[PDB]
Design a protein around this ligand. Structure first.
Ligand SMILES: [Mg+2]
Ligand SMILES: [Zn+2]
Ligand SMILES: [Zn+2]
Ligand SMILES: [Zn+2]
Lengths: 65, 196, 84, 181, 133, 772, 43, 114, 159, 263
């Protein structure tokens, strides 16, 4: 269910970095680790926020009505 | 609860400030008491943290699979390369004061579950509501606004406290209470009550 | 089956249970707008008052101690010592 | 796994081989070598507790079929592969577990009963029990707003679909005496 | 408005048994071989070591809430370096022509052995401990 | 069962509980909502109308409000509906069902209720959020913890009812429980773990904090105490400030293994005039132990004062810790590199021993001990061999643990943890066991299909060599089997005990101490002619030492004998005032002689009763204390001579023995019972208050001494049981409870046996005859 | 849900004990506390 | 459902004044000032400054219960010195330093590029 | 076995002694055996100790026993408590079980027995033979919702 | 100048690592906290939902909206609705944004914060603007729609603070260290052998001199100099969080002074 707006822990807006993150993975062919750091996510409170997210919405959208 | 048989209810929430903090400015989402560890020998819990920390840092899925050659060392070795004390401790400052905490603390990320059964779903509390038609005694369950069971065992305690009056007030004035008329010759409730 | 004020063997000292019932019963009377035989240094709670009516041995109540045979002994809250 | 020593080129060996695995992984990537193929080409067998009585089983294949010709002091201690008899080898000890316990990280560094408790609580955890929870009308349903796959996984969670429908969050915890609350 | 005991001591041993800011000192007395001393000292605020010449003083003067500065320009039994306050508890007969005493400085302990102190030593709480150089 | 003796009552409430460190021991946090529901029928009285009317105006949905107004006729004006709910002029005589307010007395209990302590009265404290909030040191009596437990609350409805709760069932009143005749509430978790640290000699505090800590203690006399140090920096010690919590007049001597009024190990304990002189403060001092600062503070200053002692100690220590911090991590379970080496091989030899036994046994060389199968003896050896192994690898680990090691750090406080925990978490876990035997051959002649038939080696039968740290299939499975055996009898040892708990309760139910100090059941049939055989209440008792049983014959003499007719064994003239003018007095020796002849009768008498030679027996009135409580209440100097007359002491002690009493009939029979029920205590009394002792051991004075006597008397009289005390139940439970704590050298013990007994079975499994 | 679908019940000498032969077939840990402990198993 | 509104943390309700000054009873020239809808931030800052004044014999503070946002400052000053003054001064000395920091920061912030 | 023993010099010393533990009982005949000290022979089978040495002894063992159950667990319980039990179990001259076969037969009112295992029946055999319940048991006043001879209800209060 | 003095090291739109020296730890902290919790800000604190054919719940979406950072520089001239004499809200105490999104294409339409549309009259004050630091310029991913899903909202952003709610925090994360070498001995490190070889070394050490072996323990020294860094969500420029922080704290103090007076 969608990328958390802001990190539970510290509050660093994070919801505006999901797509960026994904791209860095697929095309830039980077490892989750660096991809994160490049997105400015340097502390672990803010790294688990994205690294762990399970974008379930993409599966809820396949339900027609 | 963690994933290691260690459940616990919240006891209070603190806002970011009042919380102890990391020099990096990181603060905990949750704080558990060290005392719930020596006895439960639930070490993996500790380990998992060591691991989950390193992992989040290096964006690597932490492998806490059972029978593997994964050591607390190999991990501590990895976490240091990450500029952190090899065990999970991290100097922390007291939110109120800002001063340093004389005792470094085990700080890291740990998978925690949100169990069902939440206070508000339990808080029942009655003060004389509906009673059973058959026994004229308070009804069961809170969905029905019933009463709490002052069963056998509780009674014994009261008896033990020598609090005679209270007892009577509990097994009578609250719950069953009824006035009956009796024949002064054959102690049977066979006296027709015509009150008027 | 009564027992003269003499030949009295029961405890001179008041039992906790006796004083807790005495305290309760007077506290209750006090809660019912009953005369107070003490001077309130500014007390309002019946019990707290009744406690002070005892601390100044001014509670007109007597305890009847039934023995196990049927007999008994009447002791007055004035007599009974309240150490506890 | 079966072990029949029939192997001219040295000692007793498991019938399966690296060869067959590339063939197995071959099929994964395409997502023709099934599990029944291993079963048919006789590289595996189905054993019940009764037949179990008559067999010798090696735990790890590797660590149990090399010849004894320094040891990491932090690794646990294991005895030895004393047996010129192995007829089978365990697919993988972690398999002695089942669904519930399967989600415990390092339950092999945990006091016995605490593993049983956790297994009973993993069933009271919240999360998305099904991607279609919105289209199902049933007596009570509890769903987590932002489920997170655990930073600490088990090579057996991949099959239990845990990472896909996680139940729990990855909170930053601190074991410390604070307000005494 | 008094003083109750003066004496230079020679430190024979300094023991830090699993404490990092405290050491239990045992120094003998220069002059009268009869007198010996056992004391707990905060080695963090007042280091000590192998054979030091320590000057000791007891007294009971320079109990109303404690105050601090201002008098930084007033009284000053600060003719020493290290100073403590405490409550003495037991006076004992080491037997023979010797007698000892026990003081507790909020847990920091001291036992004094001698004899002429029967008079010079108090019998109550009051008791400051002064040390210098 | 479920309608007559057990009913569902009104005015009850239940929720989750959680600890609250800023709540008083005897209070209870009631979540506003619950308070707004539970009510209390208060009658209108000139001493209240103002508050009452004011509340009635507040209505049923603002806390200090009310619901319902009852009138003369018996009508119920419902305050939430009622054109006239904003009207209503209260009339003296009416009733105003009000919300539960602060300080109300309420019965709070946690189930199962197998105690009195399971149900106690607490002062109400309405607070936000929705969980009952309770003081931690109220934890154990109810046996709660905050992992989810829910608790029940009941509200007294009658003015009497309330009184009955606040005067008999109040938490204060229950600190010293009669069952274990010791206190039943200590200091735990943080407060305990901390208080210790806060105490270390190495622990000092300065101004800013001190001033806060002091203020933190509510009963502070605002008088900043002078620093232990005034030198380069004015520093206070931990003890220093904690002592503020301890009130005045509290004394406490201890002495652990190496204590010595200079306790180099900051050992034992010494508290005088409510000032902690020496010794680290941990479980033994502040735990819920017998000698405990709590047992003493309850007995000396009063239940309430001691009730407060808790919060204070807590508030201070908690704060201090809130700022010192404390934690634990894997690190705390890691042992010195060379250690794991020494450990791993420590086991390596245990295995070789087992192996060397095994080969011996297989050669038929073994010599079977009597009564055991060569097979039995074999097993027993290996099991012993392996246990020791575990225990030494464990000990080996415990030594590394630096005082800075948090785990060890809690173990030292006694706040959680024990050897075992360390030993298993750090070194070898141990030999698993099911049904008292090492893992069985579920498979034919083998443990698992991973071993060869016939293999009694340790690995094979359940010896988990690894540590929870290193990590443990076979081992797993095995350890699992035992694990299960445990969980199972766990479920059993609960029901079986629950049942016993009742049969005991029904059986004795109606037994109580009547007004003639007798103990009879409903019928009147006497059961005990004097309760507990001394008609003394269990709570008012403590383990005292009968100084006349032990010691060589010479020491018994060097101690009590006074022979004025003997220059070498007379009372030196420094002790007594009449020292010189006594030497020789024959009329005085006749007494000392009479006193000394008695002490010797007692020695024989006691050694007759307590064959063991055991001199520590629970008796009312801790005499030792009274003495210490004279030692400094009259400032007694051990330098000048007493003003005591040998007649004073001797005749005084004697006389004291006449005014103890437990019965007051003027007849022979009863006058003889009374003598019996006091014999022992008196023995204690005589051995303690002996001429030498009084004079040589604790330089009393006619004044102090004279006081000590008047004192004992009163206390004694206070230690007597009160007619009404329902001993029937009180006992039943006192046995049922510690029974439900039982869950596990070849005899039938534990629950099963207790069951065997109570049922009066004839088919006992472990019979035996023990001959001498 | 997975765990429910993989459950086992045993009605009614020692049956709740985890047993040697169980290795490989039934989960050594997963089982309810008290009441039906050891009786309800999980493959 | 038993949770109090967040704003009760910084908004005085009815019959609540920012300060209450009761004279301590144990010591002389002592006063216990209770603060309302204020937490550690102020409490500790004022406690610390109040301890710079050499005419101040005592000064501590406490939030008796986390649930509620209020605290107590205790003050004892040298005969003739009114703690309320001892309080006034402190708050000022505090504001002044604050202003200062405000400036000096703003200065530096301007010499910065980025 | 370990046994402390007064030494000629006064102090208690440890004089170990041989003792035979048995795996089977027959008290009646073993005391008589020579060599053994019949003064000390013992057995955990209180019943047997009863039948052979009298009941006052039986009470002893009965306690000696219970005690061991509770203390083998490190736990302590004040004497009086267990005392009362044993005694209550021992006043009727015999060994009366805490089972129904023992104390519910006791001689008590019908209602008490009612609150334990054989209600129905107990009340019939009670009706048949017109039993009169004093109503002085706590369990019965609880059934009638009245105060009982408990702390608060032992003494009566009057003007 | 007078006491308290800074020394910025780093600086940008988001961070401000700086040395704050010659101040009391008490203050360093009070400052730190206040930054975290009492600096005001504008944030959606009320969502009126017209249509939500989405896969997400109303309040679930509403929650996220609240979290979306909004411009807040001129927040000092926007009132607290609770103080505005209007009934509910107005353009004197609020800022109303509209969100309307329709799943048009069969290729999943995403909904960003860049789609909020200020409807109220800003009154020429820089206030309430979906803050965007994205690269592509799509501040925050609010929601996603399918074939023909609708989402029609209307939010009312109000003035608030981290205390009523964390959404109102402008600060994000604040680093804070003092006495990099433990000269002050305000801690007792946990070791296995060398507490110096096991515990890392903070960048901040480089900015301070070591302990000098045999030097005694400095028992009189207190905490001076603090090495902080304020991260900034962005509703406010970093410089401001520091200033407004300092300001607010300063006002808090003043109000107690003003208190005695009215007393
Ligand atoms: Mg529990
Ligand atoms: Zn973060
Ligand atoms: Zn009739
Ligand atoms: Zn407006």
């Amino acid at each position: 269910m969608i990328v958390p707006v802001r990190c539970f822990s510290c509050g660093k807006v994070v919801g505006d970095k999901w797509e960026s993150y994904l791209n860095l993975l697929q095309e830039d062919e980077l490892d989750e680790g660096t991809a994160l750091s490049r997105l400015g996510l340097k502390r672990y409170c803010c790294r688990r926020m994205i690294l762990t997210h399970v974008d379930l919405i993409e599966k809820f959208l396949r339900y027609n009505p | 609860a963690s994933r290691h048989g260690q459940k616990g209810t919240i006891g209070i929430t603190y806002r970011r400030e009042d919380m102890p903090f990391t020099a990096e400015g990181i603060v905990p989402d949750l704080i558990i008491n060290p005392h719930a560890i020596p006895s439960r020998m639930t070490v993996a819990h500790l380990i998992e943290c060591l691991l989950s920390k390193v992992a989040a840092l290096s964006g690597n899925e932490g492998d806490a699979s059972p029978f593997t050659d994964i050591t607390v060392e190999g991990i501590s070795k990895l976490l240091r390369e990450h500029g952190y004390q090899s065990r999970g401790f991290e100097v922390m400052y007291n939110g109120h004061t800002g001063k340093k905490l004389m005792a470094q603390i085990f700080f890291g990320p740990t998978y925690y579950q949100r169990l069902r059964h939440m206070v508000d779903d339990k808080i029942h509390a009655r003060a004389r509501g509906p009673m059973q038609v058959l026994t004229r005694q308070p009804v069961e369950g809170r969905s029905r606004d019933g009463g709490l069971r002052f069963g056998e065992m509780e009674r014994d305690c009261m008896i033990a406290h020598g609090a005679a009056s209270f007892l009577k007030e509990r097994l009578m004035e609250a719950s069953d209470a009824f006035r009956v008329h009796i024949c002064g010759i054959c102690g049977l409730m066979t006296v027709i009550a015509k009150l008027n | 089956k009564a027992i003269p004020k003499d030949q009295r063997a029961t405890t001179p000292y008041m039992t906790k249970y006796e004083r807790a019932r005495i305290l309760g019963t007077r506290a209750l009377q006090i809660s019912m707008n009953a005369p107070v035989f003490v001077d309130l240094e500014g007390e309002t709670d019946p019990l707290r008052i009744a406690m002070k009516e005892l601390a100044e041995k001014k509670i007109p109540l007597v305890i009847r101690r039934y023995l196990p045979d049927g007999s008994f002994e009447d002791w007055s809250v004035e007599e009974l010592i309240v150490d506890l | 796994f079966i072990v029949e020593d029939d192997e001219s080129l040295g000692h007793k060996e498991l019938k399966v081989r690296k060869g067959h695995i590339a063939k197995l992984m071959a099929t994964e990537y395409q997502d023709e070598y099934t599990w029944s193929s291993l079963l048919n080409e006789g590289l595996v067998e189905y054993i019940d507790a009764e037949e179990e009585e008559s067999i010798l089983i090696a735990m790890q294949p590797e660590d149990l079929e090399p010849a004894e010709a320094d040891v990491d002091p932090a690794k646990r201690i294991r005895v030895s592969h004393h047996a010129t008899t192995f007829t089978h080898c365990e697919i993988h000890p972690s398999m002695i577990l089942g669904v519930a316990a399967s989600i415990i990280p390092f339950p092999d560094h945990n006091q016995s009963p605490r593993n049983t408790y956790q297994s009973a609580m993993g069933k009271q955890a919240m999360g998305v029990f099904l991607t279609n929870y919105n289209v199902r009308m049933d007596t009570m349903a509890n769903i987590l707003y932002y489920p997170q796959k655990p930073l600490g996984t088990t090579r057996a969670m991949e099959y239990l679909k845990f990472r896909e429908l996680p139940a729990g969050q990855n909170a930053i915890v601190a074991i410390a005496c604070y307000s005494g609350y | 408005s008094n003083t109750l005991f003066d004496d230079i001591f020679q430190v024979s041993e300094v023991d830090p048994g699993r404490y990092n800011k405290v050491c239990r000192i045992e120094a003998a007395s220069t002059t009268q071989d009869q007198c010996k001393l056992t004391l707990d000292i905060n080695v963090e605020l007042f280091p000590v070591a192998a054979q030091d010449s320590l000057t000791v003083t007891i007294a009971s003067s320079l109990t109303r809430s404690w105050r601090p500065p201002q008098a930084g320009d007033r009284s000053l039994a600060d003719d020493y370096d290290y100073v403590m306050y405490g409550t003495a508890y037991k006076f004992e007969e080491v037997s023979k022509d010797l007698i000892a005493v026990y003081y507790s400085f909020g847990g920091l302990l001291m036992r004094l052995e001698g004899n002429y102190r029967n008079l010079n030593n108090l019998k109550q709480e009051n008791a400051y401990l002064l040390i210098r150089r | 069962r479920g309608n007559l003796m057990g009913k569902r009552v009104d005015f009850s409430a239940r929720t989750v509980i959680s600890g609250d460190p800023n709540l008083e021991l005897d209070q209870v946090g009631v979540p506003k909502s619950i308070a707004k529901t539970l009510t209390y029928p208060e009658v209108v009285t000139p001493y209240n109308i103002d508050r009452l009317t004011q509340l009635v105006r507040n209505g049923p949905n603002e806390h200090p409000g009310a619901k319902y107004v009852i009138r003369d006729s018996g009508d119920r004006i419902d305050l939430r509906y009622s054109k006239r709910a904003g009207d209503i002029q209260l009339q003296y005589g009416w009733k105003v069902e009000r919300h539960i307010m602060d300080n109300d007395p309420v019965l709070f209990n946690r189930q199962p209720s197998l105690h009195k302590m399971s149900m106690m009265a607490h002062r109400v404290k309405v607070i936000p959020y929705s969980t009952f909030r309770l003081n931690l040191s109220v934890t154990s009596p109810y046996n709660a913890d905050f992992d989810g437990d829910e608790m029940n609350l009941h509200v007294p409805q009658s003015e009497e009812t309330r009184a009955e709760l606040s005067q008999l069932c109040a938490v204060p009143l229950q600190i010293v429980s009669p069952q274990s005749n010791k206190p039943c509430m200590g200091i735990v978790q943080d407060t305990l773990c901390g208080i210790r640290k806060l105490t270390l000699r190495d622990t000092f505090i300065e101004l800013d904090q001190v001033l806060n800590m002091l203020y933190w203690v509510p009963d502070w006399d605002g008088v900043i105490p002078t620093p232990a140090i005034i030198k380069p920096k004015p520093l206070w010690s931990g003890k220093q400030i904690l002592s503020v919590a301890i009130p005045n007049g509290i004394h406490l001597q201890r002495f652990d293994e190496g204590t010595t009024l200079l306790s180099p190990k900051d050992n034992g304990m010494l508290i005088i005039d409510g000032q902690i002189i020496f010794g680290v403060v941990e479980k033994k001092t502040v735990g819920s132990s017998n000698g405990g600062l709590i047992h003493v503070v309850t007995r000396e200053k009063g239940p309430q004062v001691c009730a407060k002692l808790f919060g204070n100690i807590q508030k201070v220590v908690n704060f201090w810790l809130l700022h010192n911090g404390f934690s634990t991590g894997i690190g705390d379970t890691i042992a010195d590199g060379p250690t794991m080496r020494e450990i791993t091989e420590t086991i390596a030899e245990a295995k070789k021993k087992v192996l060397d036994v095994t080969k011996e046994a297989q050669a038929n060389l073994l010599t079977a001990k009597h009564g055991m199968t060569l097979r039995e003896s074999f097993e027993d050896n290996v099991v012993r061999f392996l246990n020791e192994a575990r225990d030494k690898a464990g000990r080996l680990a415990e030594v590394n643990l630096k005082d800075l090691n948090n785990v060890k750090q809690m173990v030292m406080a006694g706040s959680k943890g024990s050897f075992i925990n360390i030993a298993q978490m750090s070194a070898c876990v141990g030999q698993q066991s099911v049904e008292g035997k090492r893992i069985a051959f579920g498979f034919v002649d083998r443990t698992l299909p991973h071993f060869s038939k016939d293999d009694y080696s340790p690995e094979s039968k359940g010896f988990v060599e690894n540590s929870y740290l290193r990590g443990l299939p076979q081992e797993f499975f095995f350890h699992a089997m035992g694990g299960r055996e445990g969980l199972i009898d766990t479920a059993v040892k609960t029901a079986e005990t629950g049942y016993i708990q009742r049969r005991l309760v029904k059986a004795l139910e109606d037994i109580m101490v009547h007004y003639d100090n007798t103990t009879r059941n409903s019928l009147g049939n006497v059961i005990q002619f004097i309760y507990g055989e001394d008609g003394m209440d269990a709570a008012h008792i403590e383990k005292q030492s009968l100084d006349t049983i032990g010691g060589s014959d010479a020491a018994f003499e060097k101690r009590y004998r006074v022979d004025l007719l003997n220059t070498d064994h007379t009372l030196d003239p420094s002790l007594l005032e009449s020292g010189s003018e006594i030497l020789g007095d024959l009329k005085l020796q006749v007494l000392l002689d009479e006193e000394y002849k008695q002490l010797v009768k007692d020695r024989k008498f006691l050694r007759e009763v307590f064959v063991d030679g055991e001199a520590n027996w629970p008796l009312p009135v801790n005499i030792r204390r009274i003495i210490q409580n004279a030692q400094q209440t009259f400032h007694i100097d051990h330098t000048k001579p007493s003003d005591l007359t040998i007649k004073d002491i001797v005749l005084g002690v004697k006389d004291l023995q006449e005014n103890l009493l437990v019965l007051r009939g003027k007849n022979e029979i009863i006058q003889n019972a009374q003598r019996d029920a006091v014999t022992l205590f008196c023995c204690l009394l005589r051995s303690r208050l002996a001429t030498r002792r009084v004079l040589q051991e604790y330089r009393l004075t006619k004044q102090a001494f004279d006081w000590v006597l008047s004192n004992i008397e009163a206390q004694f009289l206070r230690s007597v049981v009160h007619p009404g005390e329902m001993v029937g139940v009180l006992a039943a439970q006192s046995i049922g409870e510690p029974a439900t704590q039982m869950t596990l050298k070849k005899v039938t013990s534990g629950v099963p046996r207790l069951k065997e007994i109570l049922n009066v079975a004839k088919n006992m499994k472990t019979p035996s005859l023990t001959v001498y | 849900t997975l765990s429910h679908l993989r459950r086992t019940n045993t009605p009614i000498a020692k049956p709740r004990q985890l047993h040697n032969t169980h290795w490989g077939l039934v989960c050594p840990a997963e089982t309810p506390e008290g009441q039906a402990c050891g009786l309800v198993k999980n493959l | 459902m038993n949770a109090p509104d967040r704003f009760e943390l910084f908004l005085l309700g009815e019959g609540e004044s920012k300060l209450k000054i009761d004279p301590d009873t144990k010591a002389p020239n002592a006063v216990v000032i209770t603060f309302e809808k204020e937490d550690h931030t102020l409490g500790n800052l004022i406690r610390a400054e109040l301890l710079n004044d050499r005419k101040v014999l005592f000064a501590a503070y406490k939030v008796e219960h986390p649930f509620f946002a209020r605290f107590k400052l205790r003050i004892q000053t040298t005969e003739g010195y009114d703690p309320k003054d001892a309080l006034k001064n402190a708050c000022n000395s505090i504001i002044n330093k604050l202003g200062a920091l405000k400036t000096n920061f703003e200065t530096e912030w301007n010499l910065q590029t980025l | 076995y370990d046994r402390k023993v007064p030494s000629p010099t006064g102090e208690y010393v440890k004089e170990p002694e041989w003792v035979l533990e048995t795996d089977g009982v027959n008290l009646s005949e073993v005391m008589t055996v020579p060599g053994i000290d019949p003064t000390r022979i013992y057995t955990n089978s209180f019943i047997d100790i009863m039948e052979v040495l009298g009941i006052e002894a039986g009470r002893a063992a009965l306690y000696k026993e219970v005690y061991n159950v509770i203390a083998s667990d490190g736990s302590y319980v004040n004497y009086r408590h267990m005392a009362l039990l044993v005694d209550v179990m021992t006043t009727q001259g015999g060994l009366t079980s805490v089972t129904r076969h023992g104390f519910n037969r006791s001689n008590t009112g019908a209602l008490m027995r009612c609150s334990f295992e054989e209600t129905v029946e107990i009340l019939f055999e009670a009706g048949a033979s017109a039993e009169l319940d004093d109503c002085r048991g706590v369990s019965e006043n609880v059934i009638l919702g009245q105060m009982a001879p408990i702390g608060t209800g032992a003494f009566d209060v009057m003007i | 100048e007078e006491g308290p003095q800074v020394k910025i090291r780093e600086a940008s739109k988001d961070n401000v690592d700086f040395i704050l020296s010659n101040v009391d730890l008490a203050m360093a902290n009070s400052l730190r906290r206040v930054m975290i919790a009492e600096i005001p800000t504008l944030a959606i604190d009320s969502v009126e939902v017209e249509t939500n054919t989405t896969v997400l719940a109303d309040e679930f979406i509403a929650h996220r909206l609240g979290l979306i950072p909004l411009q807040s520089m001129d927040i000092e001239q926007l009132e607290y609705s609770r103080d505005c004499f209007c009934e509910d809200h107005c353009d004197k105490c609020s800022v109303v944004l509209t969100l309307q999104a329709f799943g048009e294409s069969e290729s999943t339409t995403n909904v960003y914060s860049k789609d909020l549309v200020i409807v109220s009259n800003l009154m020429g004050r820089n206030i309430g603007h979906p803050i965007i630091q994205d690269k592509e310029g799509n501040g925050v991913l609010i929601c996603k729609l399918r074939k023909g899903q609708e989402l029609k909202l209307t939010c009312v952003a109000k003035k608030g603070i981290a205390k009523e709610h964390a959404k109102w925090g402008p600060a994000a994360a604040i680093e804070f260290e003092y006495d990099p070498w433990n000269k002050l001995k305000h801690t007792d490190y946990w070791y296995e052998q060398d507490s110096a070889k096991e515990w890392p070394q903070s960048k901040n050490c480089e900015y301070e001199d070591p302990p000098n072996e045999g030097d005694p323990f400095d028992y009189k020294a207190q905490a001076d100099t603090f090495y902080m860094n304020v991260e900034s969500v962005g509703s406010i420029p970093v410089d401001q969080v520091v200033v407004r922080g300092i300001d607010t704290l300063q006002k808090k103090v003043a109000s107690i002074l003003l208190a005695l007076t009215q007393m």
